[PDB]
């Protein structure tokens, strides 16, 4: 065990050190605070513990984990909050009786009190195994399986004792892998480190369509399983609906939030908001509790699990996307982890980059980018997996052009912005081709107009209506109404309704909040319909004022037909759509005449 | 679409027979000469250098 | 979207050329201010 | 315009098939010249093996190779790591490994060499010996494997530029 | 002897200075597994070397190290292409060996491959714009601008499935005529655009006549950075040796550069303005070092770097770094893109001094010079006239105003917008520019000489 | 790298020997017989390691995975036809129709195939509801139909019935009107005589009939009403003629 040399701030010495490293985590001090060794200088290495400092006496021991910082993969990871450093918050209650451990807090990683349901695979005795394989199963889901049984990666062998149907511990042991000998025992609990990506056996395209619960994130240009997306804008853009959009409304079957920098109590409205959610997919009692993981944050938490929450909340979710289902990932935010690792580069005196972030955030943001993705699942069965990664930023400098914003919207894919005007006027997100682009719309265009899509034609004219909208809206602020003819009126009287149902997204109750692809083609249909209409009954003889004002509570009703749940007509096209239709062809025919 | 239905097990049949005689000649190839460039190989291990 | 290092100078002759036609759409229209009047006196008589 | 891009898709999976068996081919065949090269370099290492088995003619190549293996650390003391029937070798030439080291140094003549207790491995290392420095921290591979597997690196594109060329 | 310390991503060794500089090393770890290394830098009894593979690993007091022998170089021979290889070594579907017949530095230390002459041979890639408005040809070195927030992997995938296709349509123009090879070199890339870039190539038919590196993103700098060195000596290589023509793609240089700030971060050297080092116009131009046409009279060696704008403008240092070197650029404008159109490559700030010499005679006409400045000079003339357009308004601009604003949105939908499979030749690249020229009168045209200009009238 | 390609290799001639023990996939199994050559032999892991890196086994990672999810898919396919058994030269048909697709991870039959997993799945976890009997009905008559038509070919019966059972999966246990009549709407939209008929017990078409009686029965305080209405609930199958005596009755 090493000494205590010195304890300045957030970084500690420690002298005779042998089994340090660079990445690897270790417990220094007798209260075992969470610690890892970032750096050494000669015959001491240089500790950077994220814990707090205050109540630790110098000349304690410090003794090396042996390798990096990682969390436990197995049964019991839904329905239990936990922090980034793998550490259980469920136990600070009954224990310390409180939410977040302050100091102090040694507390196992992974659940061992309670029982779980094991139930066998599609493997018996005396079958070929490998890492990744399905070995078993728990009912965890809302009617499939949420926590499958996997092996460890670089592993194989062959099972040599299969424990059958029934509850059993997480400490008792129920799979023996003979190969090559007694290899070792096989539990319920795994051991993964956090600092290296899951293995797979081959990485793939993202084809698959995902749905966020936008009708203008989804309707401008949604993203596919698989993909990054990057959301700028100041004080937020409202990531409360839209996490609590992409976990109810997703098609996903795990959901993973993860808070690095949260306040706490977003982090809680969002918890128990998710019980109160009732599943549309013939769910359970806490259908979205059970098939949800949850890692909160705090402001003054430690920064290992604020920076170690996007390395455990990725290693889940691969390990969640390696067994054969789609997973969702929610991180809020990455200007957190970039102004975390700001401070451990100033506290640990390395040299600072362009505008005060460390050079290490691009590798970083590249890494935890490219980390997660759609491809193959490991082992034998060859599932097919996702992992989308959904990470917002704010600005750090105080403007666009800082290179946290820059770095991260680079090496995405997939942009969707936030615009001040149109975020002033109570409208989140805002962006119709300014903030906004994809590459992924043309595939994903190809299974939603497969099914019934006219969004194909309504995206390209309604991004297109809504860019000359700002153009139309520069020369009219300008100069004024008098430079302009009656196109660019009715495409601005068109854009100012489209922006204004199409923007707004909050929701005011729980009929507002989900958003159909049926209900964004045909509002969108219907506003191409009225303003190709209002174009048509121009050419023919009429005026705008007498368009508008003529059509009135026919717009009205297609703007004001979001307040309810979809339960009518077919499945989720309601009556009240497929008669604006006729109620804007019967008015289009009057309003010519 | 025809092409595509027996074209996936043509992909061994080509492979094996487009490359089937090259095999031989470089395998008998190389076991003709091993001696000769295994002792100068052997000679030059046995060296400093 | 904008630049972050010698931008000052597009601003600065910005500046100056809006300043000098406010200047001159200020003397044009002080000019037709005083003809609309002008003539406003000859036409009301 | 239904059947054009059916056609486009008929076209990119034969042209994908014919990139997948035009790739198989030169897998095979660089597997078949990676095969034949290792072969050869298999067969080196056994007659390496084979003649490194004598202890009458081994002595002057291990000397030679004791002395080349010091001649790159200038350290005053030496620590020779060697197999079990390999220390007796050296033990009765220290004296003429020291002399003819000290011939022909650059540096300053080796006070004394120390034989390790501790032997080398014997399951894919068949002769030779392991250079370390006093410390124990520095090593330098002068054993046949690691030898011939250092000069097949620079003999490989010779013999595969005059085997297929 | 054993590692001494570690400074973020590079670690400090206490070793002997009989390894030479760039020396590969061999770190012996007690874990059971030997990682390689690159000696970044020799010091007095130490040095500062960086691991190929991982950061964390390593002892402290019980680490053993030691010396390959042999500097870091690559077998580089006529096999290499068709096969997918990767830029650190890992093999997917590589064997044992790369089938390297000679070996080459990865520096350019004693071939020297550079032009002695202007080029002759003209290279289209399929852009009317591109083709036309610069002029681009064998040897030359033009870097591709980007910005952050436009779709530039989708520029990239364009401009790497365009690459294959340039042949048939270079072959018609008689300014290609021999063997045409592309060298792909990835690094921090991500899987899906890389699998994108691959899939355009396979279904453009160039996977068998095509070299694929992949580097992750994950990995270290030395080796995203290593990999281009790497990559570029494999097509001088397989260009000098058979005289065919190599097309060197580099995407992307942000990452190259976002690499190299974070080296030296525990040598004697430190980083200079804007986080990056003052050192950093010698390692861009090593690896610009290596382009150009190849000694003997026959083939060259293209390069087409793939650089993105992260404040979207040039005063950046990395595009600003890396225009010095070059002689000039393509600007992409997100404008374009968001109202519809690709490429969305813009006239206004794009140049090139080597148009001249580049078109000929044979494979080129002389009015593209002329035509070029002419359609440059109504472009920033429209461009100029639309922005003071909606200050005013339209009763004080005139009818010069209105022939180049009409000019601007005639050449903007018709020049800048073309297909992903189709090339686009020069000699209807400039009888398009003729036509969407030919809207002002005859007096009113003076970018070109009056003889070449009443005679392409 | 090798440790997954033997393990693909083991898990493919597993899973081969595991969907057939009778020997009579020869078109599907003539493909992979240099994996089931392997596996039917006394072979360790380190000899297929070793004969996988000396070039005398496959080696693409890619390829297995990819034959390896297509036999999966297949294995999945079958498996989940359950009780039912389908024909010898359709699974061979279905697997050389699978296989001459370049896509196998979006397409129809992953899509269909997978709801049919969502239904059968859902199957074994449902309340006590009349939904789940009618979808457990309307999964046995498409399972049969999946049996007897396949995977790779069309049906309006398939779609209609696995739109139906889709519709029904995502209903909640307030629309018990919305599901009574989606299935006396699926049951008079039905040409034959029986739907259930050869495929269920007679106990779940009687307690089919019993929840139409059971929902119709309570609507009626007539004895000539309740006396006509109280002779359908005896008959052990459902039939058109019994809803359109119950519906003429109410």
Request: glycine share 6%.
């Amino acid at each position: 065990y090493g000494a205590i040399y010195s304890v300045s701030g957030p970084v500690v010495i420690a002298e005779n050190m042998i089994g340090c490293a660079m990445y690897e985590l270790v417990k220094v001090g007798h209260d075992n605070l969470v610690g890892e060794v970032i750096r050494i200088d000669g015959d001491k290495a240089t500790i950077q513990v994220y814990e707090e400092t205050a109540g630790l006496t110098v000349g304690d021991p410090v003794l090396r984990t042996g390798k990096p910082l990682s969390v436990e993969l197995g049964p019991g990871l839904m329905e239990t909050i936990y922090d980034g450093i793998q550490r259980p918050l469920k136990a600070i209650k009954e224990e310390s009786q409180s939410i977040y451990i302050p100091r102090g807090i040694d507390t196992p990683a992974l659940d061992r009190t309670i029982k779980w349901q094991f139930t066998p695979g599609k493997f018996q005795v005396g079958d070929h195994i490998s890492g990744g394989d399905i070995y078993g199963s728990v009912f965890e889901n809302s009617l499939i399986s949420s926590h499958k049984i996997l092996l460890p990666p670089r592993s194989r062998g062959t099972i040599t004792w299969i424990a059958p149907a029934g509850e059993y511990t997480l400490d008792e042991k129920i799979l023996e892998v003979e190969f090559d000998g007694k290899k070792s025992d096989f539990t319920l609990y795994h051991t993964w480190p956090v600092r290296v990506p899951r293995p797979v056996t081959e990485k793939l395209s993202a084809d698959y369509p995902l749905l966020t619960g936008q009708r203008v994130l989804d309707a401008l240009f949604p993203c596919v399983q698989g993909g990054t997306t990057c959301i700028p804008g100041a004080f937020g853009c409202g990531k409360t609906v839209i996490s609590q959009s992409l976990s109810k409304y997703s098609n996903s079957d795990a959901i993973i939030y993860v808070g690095c920098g949260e306040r706490g109590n977003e982090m809680a409205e969002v918890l128990m908001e998710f019980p109160e959610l009732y599943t549309e997919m013939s769910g359970t009692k806490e259908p979205i509790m059970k098939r949800t993981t949850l890692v909160a944050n705090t402001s003054n938490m430690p920064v290992a699990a604020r920076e170690a929450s996007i390395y455990t909340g990725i290693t889940l979710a691969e390990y969640f996307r390696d067994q054969g289902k789609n997973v969702s990932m929610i991180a809020d935010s990455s200007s957190r982890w970039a102004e975390a690792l700001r401070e451990i580069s100033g506290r640990l005196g390395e040299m600072p980059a362009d505008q005060g972030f460390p050079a290490y955030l691009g590798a970083k943001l590249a890494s935890f980018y490219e980390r997660a993705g759609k491809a193959v699942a490991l082992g034998s069965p060859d599932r097919t997996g996702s992992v989308s990664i959904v990470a917002a930023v704010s600005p750090a400098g105080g403007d666009f052009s800082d290179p946290v914003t820059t770095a991260t919207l680079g090496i995405t894919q997939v942009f969707w912005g936030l615009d001040k005007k149109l975020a002033q006027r109570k409208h989140f997100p805002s962006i119709n081709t300014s903030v906004s682009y994809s590459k992924y719309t043309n595939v994903l265009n190809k299974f939603y107009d497969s099914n019934y899509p006219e969004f194909p034609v309504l995206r390209d004219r309604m991004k297109e209506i809504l860019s000359n909208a700002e153009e139309l809206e520069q020369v009219v602020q300008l100069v004024g109404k008098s430079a302009l003819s009656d196109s660019d009126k009715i495409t601005l009287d068109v854009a100012t309704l489209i922006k204004e149902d199409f923007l707004q997204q909050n929701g005011y109750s729980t009929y507002d909040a989900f958003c159909p692809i049926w209900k964004t083609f045909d509002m969108m249909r219907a506003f191409i319909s009225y303003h190709d209409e209002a174009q048509k009954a121009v050419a023919n003889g009429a005026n705008w004022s007498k368009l508008a004002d003529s059509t009135g509570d026919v717009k009205h009703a297609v703007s004001s037909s979001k307040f309810f749940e979809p339960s009518r007509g077919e499945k989720e096209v309601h009556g009240e759509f497929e008669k604006l239709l006729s109620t804007m062809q019967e008015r289009f025919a009057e309003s010519t005449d | 679409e025809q092409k595509n239905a027996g074209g996936v097990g043509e992909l061994e049949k080509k492979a094996e027979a487009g490359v089937q005689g090259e095999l031989a000649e470089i395998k008998k190839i190389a076991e003709k000469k091993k001696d000769d460039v295994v002792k100068i190989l052997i000679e030059t291990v046995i060296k400093p250098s | 979207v904008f630049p972050t290092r010698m931008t000052l100078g597009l601003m600065k002759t910005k500046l100056k050329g809006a300043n000098q036609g406010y200047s001159l759409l200020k003397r044009k229209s002080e000019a037709l201010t005083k003809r609309f009047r002008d003539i406003t006196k000859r036409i009301d008589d | 315009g239904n059947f054009k891009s059916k056609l486009k898709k008929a076209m990119l999976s034969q042209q994908i098939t014919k990139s997948t068996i035009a790739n198989k081919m030169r897998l095979k065949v660089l597997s078949a010249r990676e095969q034949s090269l290792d072969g050869i370099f298999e067969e080196t290492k056994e007659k390496l093996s084979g003649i490194a088995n004598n202890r009458d003619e081994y002595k002057p190549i291990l000397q030679s190779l004791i002395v080349e293996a010091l001649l790159k650390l200038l350290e005053p003391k030496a620590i020779v790591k060697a197999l079990e029937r390999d220390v007796d070798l050296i033990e009765s030439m220290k004296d003429d490994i020291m002399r003819e080291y000290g011939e022909k140094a650059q540096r300053a003549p080796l006070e004394e060499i120390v034989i390790s207790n501790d032997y080398l491995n014997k399951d894919l290392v068949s002769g030779g010996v392991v250079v370390s420095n006093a410390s124990d921290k520095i090593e330098i591979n002068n054993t046949l494997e690691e030898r011939l597997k250092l000069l097949s690196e620079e003999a490989l594109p010779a013999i595969r530029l005059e085997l297929y060329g | 002897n054993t590692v001494s310390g570690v400074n973020g991503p590079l670690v400090i060794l206490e070793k002997v200075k009989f390894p030479r500089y760039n020396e590969i090393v061999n770190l012996t770890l007690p874990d059971g597994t030997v990682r390689q290394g690159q000696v970044l830098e020799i010091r007095g009894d130490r040095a500062i070397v960086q691991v190929f593979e991982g950061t964390s690993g390593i002892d402290v007091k019980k680490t053993t190290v030691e010396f390959t022998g042999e500097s870091l170089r690559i077998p580089v021979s006529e096999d290499m292409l068709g096969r997918i290889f990767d830029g650190s070594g890992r093999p997917i579907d590589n064997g044992p060996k790369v089938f390297a017949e000679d070996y080459l530095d990865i520096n350019g230390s004693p071939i020297n491959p550079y032009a002695r002459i202007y080029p002759e041979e003209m290279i289209s890639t399929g852009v009317s714009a591109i083709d036309t408005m610069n002029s681009i040809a064998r040897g030359q070195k033009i870097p591709i601008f980007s910005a952050s927030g436009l779709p530039h992997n989708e520029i990239a995938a364009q401009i790497c499935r365009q690459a294959g296709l340039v042949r048939p349509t270079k072959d018609v123009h008689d300014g290609h005529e021999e063997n045409f090879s592309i060298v792909f070199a990835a690094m921090g890339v991500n899987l899906e655009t890389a699998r994108f870039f691959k899939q355009d190539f396979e279904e453009n038919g160039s996977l068998e006549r095509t070299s694929l590196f992949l580097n992750l993103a994950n990995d270290p700098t030395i080796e995203r950075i290593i990999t281009p060195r790497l990559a570029l000596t494999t097509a001088e290589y397989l260009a000098y040796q058979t005289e065919r023509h190599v097309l060197t793609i580099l995407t992307d240089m942000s990452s190259y550069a976002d690499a190299l700030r974070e080296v030296s971060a525990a040598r004697e050297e430190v980083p200079g303005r804007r986080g990056y080092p003052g050192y950093m116009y010698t390692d861009l131009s090593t690896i610009y070092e290596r382009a150009g046409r190849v000694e003997g009279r026959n083939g060259s060696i293209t390069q087409i770097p793939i650089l993105t704008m992260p404040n979207d403008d040039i005063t950046h240092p990395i595009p600003d770094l890396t225009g010095y070197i070059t002689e000039g650029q393509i600007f992409v404008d997100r404008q374009l893109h968001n109202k519809g159109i690709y490429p969305p490559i813009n006239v206004l700030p794009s140049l090139s001094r080597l148009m001249k010499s580049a078109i000929g005679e044979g494979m080129t006409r002389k009015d593209h010079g002329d035509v070029s400045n002419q359609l440059y000079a109504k472009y920033a003339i429209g461009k100029d006239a639309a922005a003071m357009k909606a200050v005013v308004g339209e009763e004080a601009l005139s009818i010069e105003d209105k022939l180049s604003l009409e000019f601007l949105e005639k050449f903007e939908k018709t020049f800048i917008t073309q297909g992903a499979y189709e090339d686009r030749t020069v000699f209807e690249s400039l009888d398009q520019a003729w036509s969407l020229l030919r809207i002002y009168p005859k007096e009113m045209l003076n970018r070109i000489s009056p003889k070449i200009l009443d005679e392409f009238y | 790298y090798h440790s997954q390609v033997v393990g693909k290799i083991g898990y493919i001639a597993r899973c081969m020997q595991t969907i057939d023990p009778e020997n009579n996939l020869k078109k599907i199994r003539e493909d992979y017989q240099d994996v089931l050559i392997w596996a039917e032999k006394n072979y360790r892991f380190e000899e297929i390691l070793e004969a996988s890196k000396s070039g005398k086994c496959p080696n693409d990672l890619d390829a297995l995975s990819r034959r390896s999810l297509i036999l999966l898919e297949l294995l999945r396919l079958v498996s989940s036809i359950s009780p039912f058994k389908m024909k010898l030269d359709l699974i061979e048909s279905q697997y050389e129709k699978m296989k001459q697709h370049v896509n196998l991870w979006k397409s129809d039959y992953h899509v269909k195939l997978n709801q049919l997993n969502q239904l059968t799945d859902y199957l074994k976890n449902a309340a006590p509801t009349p939904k789940n009997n009618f979808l457990r009905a309307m999964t046995s008559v498409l399972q049969m139909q999946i049996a007897q038509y396949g995977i790779t070919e069309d049906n309006e019966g398939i779609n209609q019935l696995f739109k139906l059972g889709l519709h029904l999966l995502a209903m909640a246990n307030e629309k018990i009107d919305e599901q009574y009549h989606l299935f006396k709407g699926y049951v008079k939209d039905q040409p034959e005589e029986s739907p259930f008929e050869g495929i269920l017990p007679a106990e779940d078409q009687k307690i089919l009939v019993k929840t139409m009686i059971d929902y119709a029965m309570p609507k009626l305080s007539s004895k000539v009403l309740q006396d006509k209405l109280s002779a359908l609930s005896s008959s052990d199958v459902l039939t058109k003629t019994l809803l359109d005596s119950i519906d003429r009755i109410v």
